[PDB]
């Protein structure tokens, strides 16, 4: 098990850890901070949220993710079928020892405290000296944004359905509720188009205006449904806006190189994602080294 | 010079005139740091008695 | 010593935070008493000096006083706003201090009222004094005095409730031993506001007078052992405030109380525990419990303050990375220099 | 490098010195960045206090 190339361990650890915390990071930190149009405030909120989460929750998640990855490789190797030559008498003993060993497993307690400082200093940097690192952060942001966008599209498609061109090709007819949601979508489209910087939250008078336009179409919709549709529409619109920001920020490295703070192309999100990506690389390497050295002796002792 | 001296002796006018994010942040940071310094001295002296 | 810094921290916290958002996180000692219930005598006994004004049945305490007991080379009392030291070892200075305190009480009174809600911090130093912070409050009057404001009773109740709002505040109820618990509203309020009793402490005054009144031993034992009272507190203590005279010396009262309890038949009969009497036992128990709670609370506050300051510094860097933080005075100096530069230009 | 990529330990081209120097160079880069961050943040406040 220790005769595996470090690269394979790092790739698995990085992907597992990133997916384990991507939802929490984006939803609970990025989204609340992105609402404000003030960069300094936006940055201040991100830093406060990062400190609070990292000091208490980050080491626990990293330990669980690293232990789970070790469990996957170890348990699989215990039960890898070596073709027709695989023996079956030893499999029962292997599984019994595996379960007992897992129960006795105990990760180092001092690793959590040490790693807390390690990633704290790693994330404290705010300078990207490499052009390729900036490009890598853009690509990493695009992949993460596309995954979230696809989930948002799936929810929107479920509530509405396929396009009239597409539904004609597939011979599918929208339900009465689906058509109601489609009309609400058009209303929200015009509202967002007129006010390109509308706040995320809603107001009662806005609901009344939307409802009256629906009544003009002979459609009655409860305020709760309008709020739910608005939330999904705003999320989709914000993701598309971020994608446009990524395209503008693609050639913004040269501007950032001269510290063009006065320039409106303040790619704060790109810098923040680059810090996360750099932190993940350090965390993956550190966990790989700890797995290869620290916990091997404990595994042997328990066996 | 005369106007500045009169303004200096009246802190209330300064408070009305000095209203801004930078002003409030500096004042709050000074107060919080002063409280924290007192807390550190109190904690250290308490723990050094034993 | 240590309590001097703790008292200073509380004062600055009150000035910084007008609301009790942060002030309700530290332990405090709250004292509530009735009229002629010996509340002043008990506070004077703990302070080992009669510093409050005395009156023939009149509520001289017209304004709350924050009495802080600390460690000092001499037994002296110092005002927070005044540097004039008063030596409590001399009776002449004690009388002058009482007049000064009464004058401060009258000065702080606003228009249309008789008792002001403002609290005056008083640092009473002395060698061997217990390191704790006490709060003096006006006595609760069953009938509103004609010479006082109609809202004086409401103001006293509001101040007591505001002080008791702190979940870590220690309740110190003071009443009279010659009056039954059903005839006083303060004891009912204390029990109602603390259903758990994890911090309630009851102090009974004029125990010698109650004993001379042939009080029933069952009622006294139930009060001390917490049987008659539905609330279950940590403990109960009884102290003797003398014969009730407003001119008796503290030392004579304390010596008489010790002799009275030593020769008391109730204690020698084991009806009441020997460690549940005298002011020394009560002061030591209160000081140790209060200090331990303070130690835990101050550690949490220090970490919270450090984190809060870090957030403020981070916001400053994000918004103003190339600027320097200056106070109101320094900004005035910088502004005038820029004006002079523009004059020259 | 191509031989090292396949872990050709049996090959006599055991460039141990190159690996050791690469470790030193990587350590220097990390140390320089860490010291830069400490200088920019940790010691600025102490300098201001002493002034």
Swiss-Prot record, chain B:
Changing residue 29 to P: In OPA1; impairs protein folding; loss of function in promoting mitochondrial fusion. Signal peptide: none annotated. Residues 1-50 form a coiled coil. It is found in: Mitochondrion intermembrane space. Constitutes the soluble short form (S-OPA1) generated by cleavage by OMA1, which plays a central role in mitochondrial inner membrane fusion and cristae morphology. The transmembrane long form (L-OPA1) and the S-OPA1 form higher-order helical assemblies that coordinate the fusion of mitochondrial inner membranes. Inner membrane-anchored L-OPA1 molecules initiate membrane remodeling by recruiting soluble S-OPA1 to rapidly polymerize into a flexible cylindrical scaffold encaging the mitochondrial inner membrane. This is Dynamin-like GTPase OPA1, short form. It comes from Homo sapiens.
């Amino acid at each position: 098990l220790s005769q595996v190339t470090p690269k394979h361990w790092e790739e698995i650890l990085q992907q597992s850890l990133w997916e384990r915390v991507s939802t929490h990071v984006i939803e609970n930190i990025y989204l609340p901070a992105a609402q404000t149009m003030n960069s300094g405030t936006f940055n201040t909120t991100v830093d406060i949220k990062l400190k609070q989460w990292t000091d208490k929750q980050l080491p626990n998640k990293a330990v669980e993710v690293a232990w789970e990855t070790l469990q996957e490789e170890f348990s699989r190797f215990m039960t890898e079928p070596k073709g027709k030559e695989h023996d079956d008498i030893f499999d029962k003993l292997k599984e019994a020892v595996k379960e007992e060993s897992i129960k006795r497993h105990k990760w180092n307690d001092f690793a959590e405290d040490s790693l807390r400082v390690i990633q704290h200093n790693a994330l404290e940097d705010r300078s990207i000296s490499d052009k390729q690192q900036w490009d890598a952060a853009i690509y990493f942001m695009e992949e993460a944004l596309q995954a979230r966008l696809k989930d948002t599209e799936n929810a929107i498609e479920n509530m509405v359905g396929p396009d009239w061109k597409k539904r004609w090709l597939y011979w599918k007819n929208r339900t009465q509720e689906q058509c109601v949601h489609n009309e609400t979508k058009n209303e929200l489209e015009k509202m967002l188009k007129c006010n390109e910087e509308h706040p995320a939250y809603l107001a009662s008078d806005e609901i009344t205006t939307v409802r009256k336009n629906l009544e003009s179409r002979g459609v009655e919709v409860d305020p709760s449904l309008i709020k739910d549709t608005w939330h999904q529409v705003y999320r989709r619109h914000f993701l598309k806006t971020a994608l446009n920001h990524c395209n503008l920020c693609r050639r913004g490295f040269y501007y950032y190189q001269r510290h063009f703070v006065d320039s409106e192309l303040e790619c704060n999100d790109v810098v923040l994602f680059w810090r996360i990506q750099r932190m993940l690389a350090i965390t993956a390497n550190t966990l790989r080294q700890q797995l290869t050295n620290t916990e091997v002796r404990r595994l042997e002792k328990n066996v | 010079k005369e106007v500045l001296e009169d303004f200096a002796e009246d802190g209330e006018k300064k408070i009305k005139l000095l209203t801004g994010k930078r002003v409030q942040l500096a004042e709050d940071l000074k107060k919080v740091r002063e409280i924290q310094e007192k807390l550190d001295a109190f904690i250290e002296a308490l723990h050094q008695e034993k | 010593s240590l309590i001097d810094m703790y008292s200073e921290v509380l004062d600055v916290l009150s000035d910084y935070d007008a609301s009790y958002n942060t002030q309700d996180h530290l332990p405090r000692v709250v004292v509530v008493g009735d009229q002629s219930a010996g509340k002043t005598s008990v506070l004077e006994m703990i302070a080992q000096a009669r510093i409050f004004p005395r009156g023939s049945g009149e509520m001289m305490t017209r304004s709350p006083v924050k009495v802080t007991l600390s460690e000092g080379p001499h037994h002296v009392a110092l005002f927070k706003d005044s540097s004039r030291e008063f030596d409590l070892t001399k009776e002449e200075d004690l009388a002058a201090l009482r007049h000064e305190i009464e004058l401060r009480m009258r000065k702080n009174v606003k228009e249309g009222c008789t008792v002001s809600p403002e609290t005056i911090s008083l640092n009473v130093k002395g060698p061997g004094l217990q390191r704790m912070v006490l709060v003096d409050l006006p006595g609760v009057i069953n009938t509103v005095t004609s010479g006082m404001a109609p809202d004086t009773k409401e103001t006293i109740f509001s101040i007591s409730k505001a002080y008791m709002q702190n979940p870590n505040a220690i309740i110190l109820c003071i009443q009279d031993g010659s009056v039954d618990a059903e005839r006083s509203i303060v004891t009912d309020l204390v029990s109602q506001m603390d259903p758990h009793g994890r911090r309630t402490i009851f102090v009974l005054t004029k125990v010698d007078l109650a004993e001379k009144n042939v009080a029933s031993p069952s009622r006294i034992q139930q009060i001390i052992e917490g049987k008659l009272f539905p609330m279950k507190a940590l403990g109960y203590f009884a102290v003797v405030t003398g014969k009730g005279n407003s001119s008796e010396s503290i030392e004579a009262i304390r010596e008489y109380e010790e002799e009275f309890f030593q020769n008391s038949k109730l204690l020698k009969t084991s009806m009441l525990k020997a460690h549940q009497v005298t002011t020394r036992n009560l002061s030591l128990a209160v000081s140790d419990c209060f200090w331990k709670m303070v130690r835990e609370s101050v550690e949490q506050q220090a970490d919270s303050f450090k984190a809060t300051r870090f957030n403020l510094e981070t916001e400053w860097k994000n918004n103003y990375p190339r600027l320097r933080e200056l106070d109101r005075n320094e900004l005035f100096e910088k502004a005038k220099n820029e004006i002079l530069d523009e004059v020259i230009s």
